[PDB]
Design a protein around this motif. Structure first.
Motif, short mmCIF file in Angstrom:
data_model
loop_
_atom_site.label_atom_id
_atom_site.label_comp_id
_atom_site.label_asym_id
_atom_site.label_seq_id
_atom_site.Cartn_x
_atom_site.Cartn_y
_atom_site.Cartn_z
N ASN A 142 0.80 -1.21 0.00
CA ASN A 142 0.00 0.00 0.00
C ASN A 142 0.84 1.27 0.00
OD1 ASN A 142 -2.58 -1.74 1.21
ND2 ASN A 142 -0.65 -2.12 2.29
N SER A 143 0.52 2.18 -0.92
CA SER A 143 1.19 3.47 -0.95
C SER A 143 0.86 4.16 0.36
CB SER A 143 0.68 4.31 -2.13
OG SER A 143 1.74 4.72 -2.97
N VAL A 144 1.87 4.71 1.02
CA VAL A 144 1.67 5.34 2.32
C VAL A 144 1.61 6.86 2.23
CG1 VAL A 144 2.41 5.43 4.71
CG2 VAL A 144 2.83 3.37 3.36
N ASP A 164 12.79 16.54 4.09
CA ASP A 164 12.84 17.61 3.10
C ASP A 164 12.95 17.00 1.71
OD1 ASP A 164 12.59 19.84 4.72
OD2 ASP A 164 14.75 20.06 5.03
N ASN A 165 13.77 15.96 1.60
CA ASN A 165 13.99 15.27 0.33
C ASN A 165 12.75 14.52 -0.14
OD1 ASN A 165 15.74 14.26 -1.87
ND2 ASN A 165 15.50 12.29 -0.83
N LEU A 166 11.83 14.24 0.78
CA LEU A 166 10.62 13.50 0.45
C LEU A 166 9.81 14.11 -0.69
CD1 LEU A 166 8.77 11.53 3.19
CD2 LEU A 166 10.53 10.92 1.52
N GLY A 167 9.55 15.41 -0.62
CA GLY A 167 8.80 16.09 -1.67
C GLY A 167 7.79 17.11 -1.16
N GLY A 168 6.90 17.55 -2.05
CA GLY A 168 5.89 18.55 -1.74
C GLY A 168 5.22 18.38 -0.38
N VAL A 194 2.62 13.91 1.62
CA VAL A 194 3.22 13.17 0.52
C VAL A 194 2.83 11.69 0.54
CG1 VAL A 194 5.40 12.45 1.52
CG2 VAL A 194 5.28 13.03 -0.91
N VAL A 195 2.71 11.11 -0.64
CA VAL A 195 2.36 9.70 -0.77
C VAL A 195 3.53 8.94 -1.40
CG1 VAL A 195 -0.10 9.17 -0.68
CG2 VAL A 195 0.77 10.74 -2.43
N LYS A 215 9.56 3.06 -1.17
CA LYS A 215 10.04 4.38 -0.76
C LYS A 215 9.81 4.63 0.72
CE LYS A 215 11.39 8.76 -1.20
NZ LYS A 215 12.69 9.23 -1.74
N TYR A 216 8.63 4.25 1.21
CA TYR A 216 8.30 4.43 2.62
C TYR A 216 9.28 3.68 3.51
CZ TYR A 216 5.98 3.87 7.12
OH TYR A 216 5.69 3.84 8.46
N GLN A 217 9.35 2.37 3.32
CA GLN A 217 10.25 1.52 4.10
C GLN A 217 11.67 2.08 4.08
OE1 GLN A 217 8.05 -0.42 5.94
NE2 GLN A 217 9.06 -2.34 5.37
N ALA A 218 12.17 2.39 2.89
CA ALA A 218 13.50 2.96 2.74
C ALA A 218 13.66 4.18 3.63
CB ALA A 218 13.77 3.32 1.29
#
Length: 208
Positions: A62-64, A137-141, A145-146, A151-154
């Motif tokens: 599931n996208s988080v 900060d690197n995550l995005g907008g 963010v979704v 990506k989440y686990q990382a």
């Protein structure tokens, strides 16, 4: 270990020995331990909030969905609250030379040497929190963010990592404090035998 001085001076030195440790060991660490504890206790409060900051939007993997801003805001309030908080000395200053010493004696990663003014102090290292904010900060907008699972686990891995870095330093503190008790104990142990040798040594002298 002998000075052939009164039992008066021995009982006095002994008493003095307890005062030294109490202030240079116990207090010194009861503060660093308390200071760091209090902070991490504030970070754990964030963790509790982190749970209600995550939700699904896959669709689905599931996208988080992560409340980036909410987490960033909380994290930047923590660093603020402990930005300049010192670990040593509790309520004084020292030479940048002696300040760098203490830091190198309890690790180096735990705290950061800094100057207020009037001297220097070993403040709490806010690197873990910084890396956390850099990652967010690197995550995005913002402020939501979704990220797919990968990506989440990382990210969680990195986040969790930082947490343990503090969790560790936290335990270490407890070490540097117990060590202080050891050195203090070693002190009184030999100081006592000293007083007695003086006494028996003194008696022979008295005896002479």
């Amino acid at each position: 270990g002998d000075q052939m001085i009164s039992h008066r001076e021995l009982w006095a030195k002994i008493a003095n020995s307890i005062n030294d440790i109490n202030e240079q060991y116990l207090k010194v660490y009861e503060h660093a331990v308390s200071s760091y504890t209090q902070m991490y206790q504030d970070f754990s409060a964030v963790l509790s909030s982190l749970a209600g900051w995550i939700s699904p939007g896959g669709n689905d993997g599931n996208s988080v969905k992560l409340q980036v801003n909410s987490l960033k805001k909380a994290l930047e309030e923590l660093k603020e609250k402990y930005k300049d908080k010192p670990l040593y000395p509790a309520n004084n200053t020292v030479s940048q030379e002696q300040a760098n010493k203490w830091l190198t004696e309890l690790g180096g990663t735990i705290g950061k040497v800094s100057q207020k003014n009037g001297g220097y102090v070993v403040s709490i290292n806010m690197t873990p929190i910084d890396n956390m904010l850099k990652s967010l900060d690197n995550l995005g907008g913002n402020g939501e963010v979704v990220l797919d699972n990968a990506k989440y686990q990382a990210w969680n891995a990195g986040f969790s990592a930082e947490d343990e870095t503090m969790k560790n330093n936290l335990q270490t503190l407890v070490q540097k404090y117990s060590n202080a008790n050891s050195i203090f104990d070693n002190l009184v142990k030999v100081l006592s035998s000293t007083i007695s040798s003086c006494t028996d040594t003194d008696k022979l002298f008295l005896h002479f």
